[PDB]
């Protein structure tokens, strides 16, 4: 018998479906207070991620979760893009496992699958050589918060030597203006960071 023929035509269901809140967190001017992790529920979609791959050096592209590929291709409901600022010593803690000072008081991440958290230093962008004291974070909040919550709850610290409000002398701030400088380490450089 006889027939074969190849020519691939794969005209697709969509036409112009809305992209995503992507290129809106990757490219936002003012992120949230760190404990108020600006998770959204990223919108309906065409979240065809490739606008991911294009970007200049991230310095944190390591997909905290599934491989840094396949996100464009896989179809999940929402990746709940979080938005917050940090400085590097806190950014070190932003990873699955990897509990540390800020993922030990403020910003914790679960076992895996933190989307594809994409950190980067924001030297020129969140601190001036006046040594900016802008964005409030919580060290000595009380203790490490449980993996991946939203912490607009900035419960104050149990500092002892006193029954009244727990706070030791008075007002033990879980309100730490990130208090960094462009002349520090990047552990203490301004850091604006996108989470998924």
């Amino acid at each position, epitope marked *: 018998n006889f027939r074969v023929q190849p020519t691939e035509s794969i005209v697709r269901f969509p036409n112009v479906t809305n992209l995503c809140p992507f290129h809106e967190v990757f490219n936002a001017t003012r992120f949230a207070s760190v404990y108020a992790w600006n998770r959204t529920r990223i919108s309906n979609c065409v979240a065809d991620y490739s606008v991911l791959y294009n970007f200049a050096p991230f*310095f*944190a592209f*390591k997909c905290y979760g599934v491989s840094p590929t396949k996100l464009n291709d896989l179809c999940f409901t929402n990746v709940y893009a979080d938005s917050f600022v940090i400085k*590097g*010593n806190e*950014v*070190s*803690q932003i990873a699955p496992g*990897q509990t*540390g*000072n800020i993922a030990d008081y403020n910003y914790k991440l679960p076992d895996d699958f933190t989307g594809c958290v994409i*950190a980067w*230093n924001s*030297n020129k962008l969140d601190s*001036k*050589h*006046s*040594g900016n004291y802008d964005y409030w974070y919580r*060290l000595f909040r009380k203790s490490k918060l449980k993996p991946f919550e939203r912490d607009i709850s900035t419960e104050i610290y149990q500092a002892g030597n006193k029954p009244c409000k727990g706070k030791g002398p008075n007002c033990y701030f879980p309100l730490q203006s990130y208090g960094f400088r*462009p*002349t*520090y*380490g*990047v*552990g*203490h*450089q301004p850091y604006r960071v996108v989470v998924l």
Partner: antibody
Amino acid sequence: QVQLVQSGAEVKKPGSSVKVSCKASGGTFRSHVISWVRQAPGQGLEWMGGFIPLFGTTIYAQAFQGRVMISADESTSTAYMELSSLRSEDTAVYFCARLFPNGDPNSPEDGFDIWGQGTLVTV
Amino acid sequence: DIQMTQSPSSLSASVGDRVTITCQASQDIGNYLNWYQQKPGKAPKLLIYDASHLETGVPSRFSGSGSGTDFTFTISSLQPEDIATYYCQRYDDLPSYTFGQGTKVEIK
């Protein structure tokens, strides 16, 4: 008060490791998790990564992420960056600091930064 | 011009190291003294204007003082990052911008 004496300033060459030491200046190291500053030459800042000798495993530098074998042995009165697989990228003034999680209940005036001296690495 | 020079010109000093850095010009400056420091790998930074009164920024460590012929930009307490070359421009009330030579305060 506290000084966090650091090792010196020498160049190291590719493939090998760069040794530096944030040395103990009269106690005041135990809490004081000796992390590590890098300070890229003149382009930007950096954090070499440090070790967490405070009763647990170590954090590694975000920038290099896998061969930053940053060990630090506080009781021995020495810290280390222990960067195996160096090439050239260093060319920097890697500092030892009392990086943010490193205050004492003493010395609050040297609050959350007791910096070091610096180490010029290059090729 | 008064053709700005500083005289101490190369005060070598590590952390703290009770500091004296003075932009004594050829002649007197009155209240027309800039004291500069340059941040390497970047654009310069003018910390202090006439004899004192540091800019918002470049913290108090680099501290302006001295009122006479020689105006003293002493550091109370530097740290390893305060490696910064201490030249000094002189804001002349009509622009003349005579900078300095560099009195770098060091670390080991």
